[PDB]
């Protein structure tokens, strides 16, 4: 519909203490007058730039700092103006992390990193390798449980393995990314999902395993580990389960480096209440009390606000995150994240499944990472063999990456030649996050020609 003024609707994870928010927003209407409305849409950081780009959503989203360049590619965020002295209650890295192109498109909340996590009334010593864990999988089976169990379905869980041995996103040079330098076709990565694969062929792990089937097995005291983030931590203390939180086991004598995400709230380029939304989050939410008020619903983990952290400090739980993190990598916050993401929970969930071998998931994905450049190369195939584009058009105006106008000008040409130059100009000038959706509609409804198109280009670039 459209925005209203005077209100505050905003959007965060369901995952993340949305009442502890609610609880905040309940102290902002008291005290201004203002309503605060908390959302937990699913798939909200899908759901967020197709709504936006039309000037709709909520006054303010809240996720991880890693999709917030693609947002701001696309327009969707306002630049944020908080003061020197603001700036100086949060951690510099932090802001950093919410940093596009020069300006601040942000403000960074909590910094989230996995760790092991393990029922200590069973598993006295955790393994500090992945090596031991199908020995340790084997002899826990005899009492009727199971090693380890986590979420295989978010590339998110598995990522830290993937990297261990040199699996990388895009390749940091001393300053930049470098959007052509994709590791995740190294051998690094190849070992460390090869390990995944192996757990699952010799049984040690099922491919099947997701959130809920992962979350419910280890707060039941079924398997003696898992792999989450702090809000999980929650859900395990009301089970009155004794556990522990601690550093990622190794792979090879090498850390498990898991991506660190900054949990970071952006106010929409089209909300008419961005004063509003600075005042809720600078004065409210980012102060001790609003912090903990969300902490008690879920727990945020480490945080970028220096007093609140300083008081987490004691806690061994946070320290563990912290150490988990340091051993990771702060994620790029560029437009090209999301294709990469896309490219790894593609990869993942074939190669455990068997539908690929780790080899073919990793090229692929290789390919599937860098996914506006290939379109854009492959202009001149694409026009003549990509065909009826009436599910192609369909992706694009469901993902609002098309309007109904630019749809029937693509349909209005006479033959398919001429239908698919016009769909192909039109898209690209759209941002990465619509190539995406165009690359990934072709490479879901026509998955030969993408395949065709990426062996063609190996002959070209042989000879
Ligand atoms: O699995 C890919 C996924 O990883 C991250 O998503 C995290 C998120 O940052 C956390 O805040 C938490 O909610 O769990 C999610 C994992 O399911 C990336 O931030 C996200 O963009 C990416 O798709």
Redesign the pocket.
């Known amino acids: 519909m459209k925005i209203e003024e005077g209100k505050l609707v905003i959007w965060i994870?369901g995952?993340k203490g949305y009442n502890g928010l609610a609880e905040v927003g309940k102290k902002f209407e008291k005290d201004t007058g203002i309503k605060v409305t908390v959302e937990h849409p699913d798939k909200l950081?899908e759901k967020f730039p197709q709504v936006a780009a039309t000037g709709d959503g909520p006054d303010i989203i809240f996720?991880?700092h890693?999709?917030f360049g693609g947002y701001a590619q696309s327009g969707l965020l306002a630049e944020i103006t908080p003061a020197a002295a603001f700036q100086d209650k949060l951690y510099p890295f932090t802001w950093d992390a919410v940093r596009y192109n020069g300006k601040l498109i942000a403000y960074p909340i909590a910094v989230?990193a996995l760790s092991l996590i393990y029922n200590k009334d069973l598993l006295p010593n955790p393994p500090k390798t992945w090596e031991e864990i199908p020995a340790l999988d084997k002899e826990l089976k005899a009492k009727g449980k199971s090693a380890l169990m986590f979420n295989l379905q978010?590339?998110?869980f598995t990522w830290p393995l993937i990297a261990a041995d040199g699996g990388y996103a895009f390749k940091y040079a001393a300053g930049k990314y470098d959007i052509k330098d994709v590791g995740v076709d190294n051998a690094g990565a190849k070992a460390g999902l090869t390990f995944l694969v192996d757990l699952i062929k010799n049984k040690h792990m099922n491919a099947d395993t997701d959130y809920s089937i992962a979350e419910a097995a280890f707060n039941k005291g079924e398997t003696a580990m898992t792999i989450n983030?702090p809000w999980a931590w929650s859900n395990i203390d009301t089970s009155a389960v004794n556990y522990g939180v601690t550093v990622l086991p190794t792979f090879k004598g090498q850390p498990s480096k898991p991506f660190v995400?900054v949990?970071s709230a952006g106010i929409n380029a089209a909300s008419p209440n961005k004063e509003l939304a600075k005042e809720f989050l600078e004065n409210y939410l980012l102060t001790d009390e609003g912090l903990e008020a969300v902490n008690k619903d879920k727990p945020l983990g480490a945080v970028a606000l220096k007093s609140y952290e300083e008081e987490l400090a004691k806690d061994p739980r946070i320290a563990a995150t912290m150490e988990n993190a340091q051993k990771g990598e702060i994620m790029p916050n560029i437009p090209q994240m999301s294709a990469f993401?896309y490219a790894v929970?593609t990869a993942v969930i074939n190669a455990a499944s068997g539908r690929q071998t780790v080899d073919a998931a990793l090229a692929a994905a290789q390919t599937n990472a860098v996914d506006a450049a290939f379109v854009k190369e492959n202009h001149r195939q694409l026009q003549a063999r990509m065909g009826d584009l009436k599910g192609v058009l369909d992706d694009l105006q469901d993902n609002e990456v098309l309007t109904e106008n630019e749809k029937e000008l693509v349909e209005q040409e006479k033959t398919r030649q001429s239908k698919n130059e016009a769909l192909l100009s039109m898209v690209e000038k759209k941002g990465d996050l619509a190539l995406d959706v165009l690359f990934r509609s072709i490479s879901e409804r026509d998955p030969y020609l993408v395949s065709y198109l990426r062996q063609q280009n190996l002959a070209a670039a042989l000879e």
């Open positions: 994870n995952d950081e996720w991880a890693d999709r989230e978010e590339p998110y983030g995400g949990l993401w929970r």
